[PDB]
Design a protein around this ligand. Structure first.
Ligand code: MG
Ligand code: MG
Ligand code: MG
Ligand code: MG
Ligand code: MG
Ligand code: MG
Ligand code: MG
Ligand code: MG
Ligand code: MG
Ligand code: MG
Ligand code: MG
Ligand code: MG
Ligand code: MG
Ligand code: MG
Ligand code: MG
Ligand code: MG
Ligand code: MG
Ligand code: MG
Ligand code: MG
Ligand code: MG
Ligand code: MG
Ligand code: MG
Ligand code: MG
Ligand code: MG
Ligand code: MG
Ligand code: MG
Ligand code: MG
Lengths: 117, 70, 155, 67
RNA sequence: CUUGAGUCUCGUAGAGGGGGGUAGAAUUCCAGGUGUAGCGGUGAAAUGCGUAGAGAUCUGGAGGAAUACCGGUGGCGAAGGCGGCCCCCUGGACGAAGACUGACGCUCAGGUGCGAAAGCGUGGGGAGCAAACAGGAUUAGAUACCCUGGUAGUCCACGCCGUAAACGAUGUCGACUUGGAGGUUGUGCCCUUGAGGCGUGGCUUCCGGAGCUAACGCGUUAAGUCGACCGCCUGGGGAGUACGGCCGCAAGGUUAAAACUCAAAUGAAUUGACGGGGGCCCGCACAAGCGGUGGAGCAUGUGGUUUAAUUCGAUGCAACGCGA
């Protein structure tokens, strides 16, 4: 509805899925798209291509808002830390800032036990 | 790792600058370490093993600087 | 093929139109080393095709090839606990070979009286973009668009 | 190639109040640079790191670049 | 008597110990805003979560636990162990110079104290993690590995327990015996001339000489050469078990046999072979292809059955149109 023209792209890049959320400067979400919701399930979901498709879908989900430039906040170690950024640029956006916001505890909680696979 | 794109900066080189900043900060490696708990006995063993390997290559290099393969 | 680099056997052009492209077609159609009967089928089918659609025989055959020739296929790479179909672009030489084989198999499955009629209808259908041969190209391409996620990353 | 500035200036105790030098031994993200890279002696590195932690408490240097 | 062992003076480094504060990341939870169909998870899934609005994202709040980077075959401690920062209380070590005491030393059965984790008692606390447990998978089964959850416990106080591959699988103390490259921490001297030179202590890592060793290896931090004292071993199993004593709230700990049974058990190294170890390289091995076999009728061989006899032999590949 309203035009903001200055958004922020939040990219949640886990080992299993990629969630792309576009919001304004104050954190209010405008649209989102995920690899799982873009026609990829199981193995195909955790692929850089699937993350890239999700970024493209999130662009059309937000194009009515008339966003010109936006910042990129990348969180997570998984695949799709990169392809989603290129897909956002290829969607016709001005990438102004790129910052990593992965939560890095300073020796906080005890992580789960090692998988014996 | 906060990257700001400069004027007349192509996006591709800005992305490349972002990869380096993350790499020098060791963000990806940190998350790998913290995915599962490592018993203190294990990391002490792992740290010692890495120290031995690091030292072993330093000494092994000298004998390869003294050997004529042919 | 582990180490042996293999060159290429040269094929003689067909006696009538002098085309290396068509000489491969009669080889694929030929069964049990009956080359003479194979080219008779091909030549008569081309004669029917040329009259049925106006274009020169060689040009008409080419048009059918363009409508059947694939550009991407899926190779198979097993993964621990699953099998992955990796999309890979196909070489121009293998492009023609796959198209020629698909037309021949489609013609053999058709219900027409003679093999020449079986063949001639197939290039006619292929030139108009319908039939089993082009349907195979559709299936191969759809399979390779669905697995675009595994391309490059698992090449 | 990298030598210890502290040892070459006879710095005695590194001062948490001297922000100018401390920024030379923290990364862009605020992490403490290892002495392997800066070439500082082990004795001053312990003093240097200790000093940085106090500055961080006093909010003279960031803990992280995000904050 | 002063050379062993101590005391004093001045300094140095240190996650040494106890107590009390505090800070910043992050997880979880609570409330709210934006927002919409998925999230989560796996080898693949499903349980689970979600239109009662999740996940994602932003703001505010609560609480517990642990201290990224520094960080180092770095440091300290008798060992167990000790890692944010600050204060209070406190132990030891080391160095410099001189003074002092004058063998006051070493070891140590019994004894006493300390002693990871788990566990136990009482009272607190409880975010994350996670025995038990529950569900979903996997499977021939799966009381497992994997997934979603999850109680004790992990945290604090005070007691108890006294065990670990509590390991350097190497008791303590002292003396002696070629070297090399480092780490760490003192200190003396020299145009300080420097991001210098020459010494002299403590601790420590990796090589390696003689010597030693069954060998592997150890090698001035000895497993070398010696001295002092202590602990301990005497084939494998039975068995660190039974009984007894002592200790413990309990779990159990400690001390510690015998009958019986065997001709071995074991250590290191060697040659092979093997590996759901690694590396390199091949082969119609796979892949890329074409044509078959397995179904039909018949030919033929074999098994089986049958028969008075169905002669004998060949039996994974490498027997079965084979001896024929
Ligand atoms: Mg998990
Ligand atoms: Mg409901
Ligand atoms: Mg002291
Ligand atoms: Mg006297
Ligand atoms: Mg005793
Ligand atoms: Mg405990
Ligand atoms: Mg308790
Ligand atoms: Mg309680
Ligand atoms: Mg579990
Ligand atoms: Mg179960
Ligand atoms: Mg859990
Ligand atoms: Mg014991
Ligand atoms: Mg231990
Ligand atoms: Mg022992
Ligand atoms: Mg040695
Ligand atoms: Mg015996
Ligand atoms: Mg006996
Ligand atoms: Mg007992
Ligand atoms: Mg007893
Ligand atoms: Mg082998
Ligand atoms: Mg094949
Ligand atoms: Mg048959
Ligand atoms: Mg027979
Ligand atoms: Mg015989
Ligand atoms: Mg026989
Ligand atoms: Mg025989
Ligand atoms: Mg034969």
């Amino acid at each position: 509805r309203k035009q903001v023209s200055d958004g922020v792209a939040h990219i949640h890049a886990s080992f299993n899925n990629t969630i792309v959320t576009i919001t304004d400067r104050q954190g209010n979400a405008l649209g989102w798209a995920t690899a799982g919701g873009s026609g990829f399930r199981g193995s195909r979901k955790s692929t850089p291509f699937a993350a890239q498709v999700a970024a493209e879908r999130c662009a059309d989900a937000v194009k009515e808002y008339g966003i010109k430039n936006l910042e990129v906040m990348v969180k997570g170690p998984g695949p799709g830390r990169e392809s989603t950024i290129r897909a956002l640029n290829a969607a016709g956006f001005r990438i102004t800032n790129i910052t990593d916001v992965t939560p890095i505890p300073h020796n906080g909680c005890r992580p789960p036990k090692k998988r014996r696979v | 790792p906060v990257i700001k794109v400069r004027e007349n900066e192509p996006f591709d080189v800005a992305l490349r600058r972002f990869k380096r900043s993350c790499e020098k900060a060791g963000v990806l490696a940190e998350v790998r370490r913290r995915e599962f708990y490592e018993k203190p006995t294990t990391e002490r063993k792992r740290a010692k093993a890495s120290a031995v390997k690091r030292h072993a290559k330093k000494l092994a290099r000298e004998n390869a600087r003294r050997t004529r393969l042919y | 093929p582990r180490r042996r680099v293999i060159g290429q056997r040269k094929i003689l052009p067909d006696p009538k139109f002098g085309s290396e492209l068509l000489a491969k077609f009669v080889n694929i159609l030929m069964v049990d080393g009956k080359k003479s009967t194979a080219e008779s089928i091909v030549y008569s089918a081309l004669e029917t095709l040329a009259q049925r659609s106006g274009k020169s025989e060689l040009e008409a055959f080419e048009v059918a090839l363009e409508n059947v020739r694939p550009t991407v296929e899926v190779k198979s790479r097993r993964v621990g606990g699953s099998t992955y179909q990796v999309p890979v672009e196909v070489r121009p030489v293998r492009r023609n070979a796959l198209a020629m084989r698909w037309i021949v198999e489609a013609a053999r499955k058709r219900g027409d009286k003679s093999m020449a009629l079986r063949l001639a209808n197939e290039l006619s259908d292929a030139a108009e973009n319908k039939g089993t041969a082009v349907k195979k190209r559709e299936d191969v391409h759809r399979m390779a668009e669905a697995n675009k996620a595994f391309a490059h990353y698992r090449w | 190639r990298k030598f210890c500035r502290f040892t070459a200036e006879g710095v005695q105790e590194i001062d948490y109040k001297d922000i100018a030098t401390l920024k030379n031994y923290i990364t862009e993200s605020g992490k403490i640079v290892p002495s392997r890279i800066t070439g500082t002696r082990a004795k001053y590195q312990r003093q240097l790191a200790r000093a940085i932690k106090r500055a961080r408490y006093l909010s003279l240097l960031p803990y992280t670049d995000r904050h």
